[PDB]
Amino acid sequence: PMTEYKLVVVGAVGVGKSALTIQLIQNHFVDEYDPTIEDSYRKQVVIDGETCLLDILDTAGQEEYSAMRDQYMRTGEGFLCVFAINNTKSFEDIHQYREQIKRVKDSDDVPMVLVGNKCDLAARTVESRQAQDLARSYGIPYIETSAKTRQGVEDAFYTLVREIRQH
Amino acid sequence: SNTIRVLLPNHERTVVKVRNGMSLHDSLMKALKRHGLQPESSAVFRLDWNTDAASLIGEELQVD
Ligand SMILES: Nc1nc2c(ncn2[C@@H]2O[C@H](COP(=O)(O)OP(=O)(O)NP(=O)(O)O)[C@@H](O)[C@H]2O)c(=O)[nH]1
Numbered sequence: 001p002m003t004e005y006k007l008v009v010v011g012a013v014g015v016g017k018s019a020l021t022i023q024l025i026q027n028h029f030v031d032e033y034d035p036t037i038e039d040s041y042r043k044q045v046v047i048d049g050e051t052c053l054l055d056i057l058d059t060a061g062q063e064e065y066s067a068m069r070d071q072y073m074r075t076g077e078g079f080l081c082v083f084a085i086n087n088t089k090s091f092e093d094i095h096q097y098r099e100q101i102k103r104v105k106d107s108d109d110v111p112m113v114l115v116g117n118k119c120d121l122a123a124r125t126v127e128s129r130q131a132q133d134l135a136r137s138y139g140i141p142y143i144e145t146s147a148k149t150r151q152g153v154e155d156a157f158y159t160l161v162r163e164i165r166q167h
Numbered sequence: 168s169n170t171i172r173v174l175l176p177n178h179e180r181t182v183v184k185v186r187n188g189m190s191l192h193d194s195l196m197k198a199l200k201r202h203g204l205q206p207e208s209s210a211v212f213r214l215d216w217n218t219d220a221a222s223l224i225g226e227e228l229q230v231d
């Protein structure tokens with residue numbers, strides 16, 4: 001009665017990919033910004049009455065990601081594209097990450113979830129209705145999360161698992 | 168390369184960067200607490216914590 005899902009967290013350099021991951025695992029938000037290279041975490045949860053084993057990957061950005069991005073995109077089965085609502089450069093990169101994933105998977109229907117992190121800060125640079133239209137063109141859900149207040153953090157990861165489970 | 172990959176229990180793993188003349192314990196101390204593990208209770212499989220970090224470039228080690 002065990003089902004194992006492999007999750008991949010991609011995004012810009014500073015959008016809270018590790019903060020969202022640590023908040024789900026440790027239930028603890030880290031204030032200091034430490035760049036992460038490649039970290040894999042495991043956790044067994046219960047989603048809709050089914051015990052699921054989750055393998056989450058913490059990818060990096062910039063040149064370190066540029067070279068070694070094509071390998072883990074072929075291994076993972078669900079991608080949690082994360083952007084921060086406090087910088088627009090990260091939201092503009094979301095298109096580039098999907099094109100690389102779709103080119104690796106050689107398919108136009110890959111389980112993905114658009115996530116606007118850092119939704120606890122005022123003066124957002126990216127309105128919600130913007131990311132709604134983007135996720136609509138991709139055929140994927142859109143959740144606003146905050147790794148500091150774990151707002152919608154459990155809802156985001158569980159939604160990506162449901163996108164895999166129903167795929 | 169300045170990159171070193173490390174494996175962890177429960178099918179976890181992490182990749183840490185090292186510098187010239189860095190301690191094994193002092194180079195990955197943040198990654199151990201980030202995954203949730205103390206270096207006192209940790210066990211590298213085998214080597215010593217006083218081993219140079221740059222001296223282990225290109226190899227993979229496990230922790231228990
Ligand atoms: N208010 C707020 N700040 C956040 C949130 N998530 C991250 N931050 C801030 O942004 C910093 C960077 O977080 P981090 O997880 O390192 O970003 P990242 O996308 O994983 N980059 P990397 O993968 O290189 O570690 C955090 O240290 C924190 O100060 C959030 O949900 N809300």
Ligand SMILES: [Mg+2]
Nearest residue numbers: 017018035036
């Ligand atoms: Mg990180």
